Design a protein around this ligand. Structure first.
Ligand SMILES: *[B]([O])([O])[C]([N]C(=O)[C]C1=[C][C]=[C]S1)C1=[C]C(C([O])=O)=[C][C]=[C]1
Ligand SMILES: [Zn+2]
Ligand SMILES: [Zn+2]
Ligand SMILES: [Zn+2]
Ligand SMILES: [Zn+2]
Ligand SMILES: [Zn+2]
Length: 356
């Protein structure tokens, strides 16, 4: 069917059902970007959503952090199989003597939690927290989705090149990817484009600052820049190091059921059913530890995959999925944190129609 009717017919009922004030949708098909914009960025002002509206993308940020980490590895800052304490002198002698950088990146260090404990909320206390942490599971055996885990990976990866994370992201990675309207901290000059998010009580909210927030869930961007990053994941040509870095993000390290964990990106064998894609993105996988299917060696996952990432903040809900072999992708950025199941069902419906 026609593209506008396909997208509208799936997105509009969902926006009504979940009272989502605004959504920017971007689709890749036939080598071209297409933008579908709904509703408002700011309920009070009535500013309309466009592909230039800045949304909080939450944990979709982890795909950019993972790309930065891979870039630092390609540039020689570390090897993925290095022990974490080789790259954090303050962790020498801790449990991180027995955890690799790859395990940190892929949530398999041994039971680091979803969030930092409440008062682990300064750099000093963060260091003490990791230095004193007692593993729950042997390294590499269990996947427990974790902000502290990938957060530390990003932080250490940037330090391995001698820079803070925010500097390496903003001055090197984003410009090299051609993302010039993507930010960790939205500058005053771009504030007019920044949406508000909406809480369950319909109050306007924005992201909460926090330890390793930048690395784990801190990016603000619009659908056009985010789709440009997806395009770089479909086939990128340019900086050899950045090309290699993106390839590393498509390497699989272990699996949990039908989901294979990469750096940032999670993927599925394609074609993939709605049921499987939902399950891989459900709480049984995202909010509890699971034993992994170990890989003999990390594997390039290739083009016949659906790669995806969910992300949220208090006021925002994002999802991205792409299928390189079919030249199709979707970005959906909303200013309500609405259920992941709805995001996945809508994206799967649209992608299925894009592949006919
Ligand atoms: B990520 O998976 O979206 C990540 N995001 C955050 O920690 C930022 C949020 C602040 C309030 C709601 S999300 C994350 C999200 C969740 C979650 O949705 O319960 C859990 C762990 C990490
Ligand atoms: Zn178009
Ligand atoms: Zn405190
Ligand atoms: Zn940091
Ligand atoms: Zn540090
Ligand atoms: Zn720039």
């Amino acid at each position: 069917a026609p593209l506008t009717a396909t997208v509208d017919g799936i997105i509009q009922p969902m926006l009504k059902a979940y009272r989502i004030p605004g959504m920017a949708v971007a689709v890749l098909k036939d080598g071209k970007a297409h933008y579908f914009n709904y509703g408002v960025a700011n309920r009070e002002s009535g500013q309309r959503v466009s592909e230039q509206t800045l949304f909080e993308i939450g944990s979709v940020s982890k795909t950019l952090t993972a790309t930065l980490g891979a870039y630092a590895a390609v540039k020689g800052g570390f090897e993925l199989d290095d022990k974490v304490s080789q790259h954090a002198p303050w962790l020498k002698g801790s449990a991180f003597d027995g955890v690799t950088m790859a395990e940190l990146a892929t949530y398999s260090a041994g039971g680091l939690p979803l969030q930092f404990p409440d008062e682990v909320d300064s750099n000093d206390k963060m260091q003490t927290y990791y230095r004193s942490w007692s593993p729950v599971y042997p390294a590499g055996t269990h996947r427990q989705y974790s902000n502290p885990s990938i957060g530390l990976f990003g932080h250490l990866a940037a330090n391995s090149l001698g820079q803070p994370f925010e500097q390496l992201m903003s001055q090197t990675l984003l410009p090299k990817l051609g993302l010039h309207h993507t930010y960790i901290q939205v500058p005053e000059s771009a504030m007019a484009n920044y949406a508000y998010g909406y809480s369950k009580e319909d109050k306007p909210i924005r992201a909460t600052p926090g330890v390793l927030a930048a690395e784990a869930y801190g990016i603000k961007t619009g659908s056009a820049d985010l789709l440009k990053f997806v395009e770089a994941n479909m086939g990128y040509q340019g900086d050899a190091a950045l090309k290699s870095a993106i390839a590393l993000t498509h390497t699989g390290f272990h699996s949990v059921g039908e989901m294979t964990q990469g750096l940032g990106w999670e993927s599925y064998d394609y074609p993939v059913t709605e049921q499987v894609l939902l399950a891989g993105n459900s709480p049984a996988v995202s909010f509890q530890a699971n034993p992994v299917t170990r890989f003999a060696v990390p594997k390039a996952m290739g083009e016949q995959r659906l790669y995806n990432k969910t992300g949220s903040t208090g006021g925002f809900g994002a999802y991205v999925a792409f299928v390189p072999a079919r030249g199709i992708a979707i970005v959906m950025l909303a200013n309500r944190n609405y259920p992941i199941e709805a995001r996945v069902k809508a994206a799967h419906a649209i992608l299925s129609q894009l592949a006919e």
